[PDB]
Design a protein around this ligand. Structure first.
Ligand SMILES: *C\C=C(C)/C=C/C=C(C)/C=C/C1=C(C)CCCC1(C)C
Length: 137
């Protein structure tokens, strides 16, 4: 698979529930959900090396990793973490995260390329899974 693309979100489910697990207060959850329903993921994939640029209207962040090599990024609720990405299958990867400081719910994310041209992302905090779907623009 080639995950490279300028991905635009078309669906987002269970994001508020995810943020609730992470302890984000309700007022702040609603505006975070609002930012998510119009946010973008740009991916450049070169073999097992990935360059990810995630952005909203006012914020952008770059995440660069190689499958199987630990890197540093941040959790959904904005805390620094050490991350490790592995393939689960031909078209799906999974990232496990460990907080650099403190404790919290266990968090992870996945990316999957479907046969029909979609990118499915998930983000997990303990038992709650958020699922987001993107198409190329
Ligand atoms: C797909 C791979 C990675 C590392 C994605 C990381 C995504 C984020 C840090 C996204 C954060 C945001 C969300 C979930 C929705 C809108 C607001 C943010 C850009 C802060």
């Amino acid at each position: 698979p080639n995950f490279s693309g300028n991905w635009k979100i078309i669906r987002s489910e269970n994001f508020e529930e995810l943020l609730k697990v992470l302890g984000v207060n309700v007022m702040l959850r609603k505006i975070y959900v609002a930012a998510a329903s119009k946010y973008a993921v740009e991916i450049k994939q070169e073999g097992d090396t990935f360059y990810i640029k995630v952005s909203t209207t006012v914020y952008t962040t770059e995440i660069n990793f190689k499958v199987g090599e630990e890197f540093e990024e941040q959790t959904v609720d904005g805390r620094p973490c050490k991350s490790l990405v592995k393939w689960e299958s031909e078209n799906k990867m999974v990232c496990e995260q460990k907080l650099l400081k403190g404790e919290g719910p266990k968090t992870s994310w996945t990316k999957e390329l479907t046969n029909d041209g979609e990118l499915i992302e998930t983000m997990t905090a303990d038992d709650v899974v958020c699922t987001q779907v993107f198409v190329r623009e």
